[PDB]
Structures are given as structure tokens and as C-alpha cells.
């Protein structure tokens, strides 16, 4: 049950996906501007 929280969908898996995307769109912005 390693990805059990995001494989089940639901609020705790949809918030995890949103948090991941937020962090990495931030990092992709601060990685592209530094290119």
C-alpha cells in the first residue's frame, strides 16, 4: 500500500496531486527563468 492514498482518489489523493503540481510548477518556473 505504498501509493494507497492517491490510488484511492478522494480528498486526500486529490490534495496530494494538487500540492505536488503546485510545488513543481513553482520549481519549473524558477528553473526555466534560470536558463
Amino acid at each position: 500500500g505504498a501509493g494507497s492514498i492517491r490510488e484511492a482518489g478522494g480528498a486526500f489523493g486529490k490534495r496530494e496531486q494538487a500540492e505536488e503540481e503546485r510545488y513543481f510548477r513553482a520549481q519549473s518556473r524558477e528553473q526555466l527563468a534560470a536558463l
Binding site: G3, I5, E16, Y23, F24, Q27, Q31, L32, A33, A34
Partner: protein
């Protein structure tokens, strides 16, 4: 019973996943559920085998970390683990590939990546040689040179 019975009749199963197709990654091959009987270091070479096992291990570790990410959030992860998650997302995108037959579904051109190019690109992603490039640079590219060119273009645009 039908797929479970078929499994024992094959040499190299490729299992497509809906959880992967909904991410936008195509083909939707499940990396942690596909199998091949020639995924043996004495057959594909120790470099191929080691790269494949490293990819599978970092993807399993990403799976294990996503629970912590749901509870704590991302900002409270260790730095080794933020690096793990970054490389894992990059590997996820790089496993994607534009197909010649899906040129209508994607509008992209078809790419046929040679074997050594695949091994080399995934080794370079696992080694950290592309930590500075974004993750959308690896989505629907061929060899890793195309990932570099796409990142350069994505930067030159914004």
C-alpha cells in the same frame, strides 16, 4: 480468470494502466507491473539491467513518498526526498513517447528511440545530470537531446 490465466502463457507482458493514462502519459505502460523474461543481466547486459532496476526502484520510492506528501505536504520533505520526487516525475515523463500512429491524437511527430539512447537517457536522469531542467521538458520527447532542446525552447519562450 481470463487475464490471470493468460499471464502464464506470455514471455513479456506489457500492462497498460488507466491511472497512468489519466496522467497524460502515453503509452500507459505500468512500469511497476510490466515484466519480461529477458530482463536478466546475463542477457541485456549489466548496464541495461541496472538502469531498469534503478528506474523501477525510484518509481516505487516515489509511490512510498506520495503518502508523506499528502499528509505533511511537500515543503516538509527531506532534501534527498525532494530530489527523489523530482527525478521520479522526470522519469515518469521521459517514459512517455509520441507515436507515429497517434499523430492525430497528439499532433506531435512520431519518434523511434534506439535502445542505447534509451539506456543513456535514463542513466543520465538517474545520475542527476538534468536536475536543472524542468519536468515538462521530458514529456513526449524522443532521445534526451530532444529533452534538452525542448527545455531550451521552453525557456527561450518564457
Amino acid at each position: 480468470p481470463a487475464p490471470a490465466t493468460t499471464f502464464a502463457h506470455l514471455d513479456a507482458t506489457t500492462v497498460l494502466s488507466r491511472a497512468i493514462a489519466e496522467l497524460g502519459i502515453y503509452p500507459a505502460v505500468d512500469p511497476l507491473d510490466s515484466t519480461s523474461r529477458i530482463m536478466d543481466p546475463n542477457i541485456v547486459g549489466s548496464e541495461h539491467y541496472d538502469v531498469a532496476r534503478g528506474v523501477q526502484k525510484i518509481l516505487q520510492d516515489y509511490k512510498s513518498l506520495q503518502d508523506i506528501i499528502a499528509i505533511l505536504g511537500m515543503d516538509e520533505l527531506s532534501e534527498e526526498d525532494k530530489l527523489t520526487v523530482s527525478r521520479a516525475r522526470k522519469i515518469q515523463r521521459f517514459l512517455s513517447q509520441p507515436f507515429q500512429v497517434a499523430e492525430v491524437f497528439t499532433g506531435h511527430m512520431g519518434k523511434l528511440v534506439p535502445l542505447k539512447e534509451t539506456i543513456k537517457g535514463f542513466q543520465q536522469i538517474l545520475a542527476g545530470e538534468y536536475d536543472h531542467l524542468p519536468e515538462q521538458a521530458f514529456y513526449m520527447v524522443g532521445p534526451i537531446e530532444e529533452a534538452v532542446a525542448k527545455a531550451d525552447k521552453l525557456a527561450e519562450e518564457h
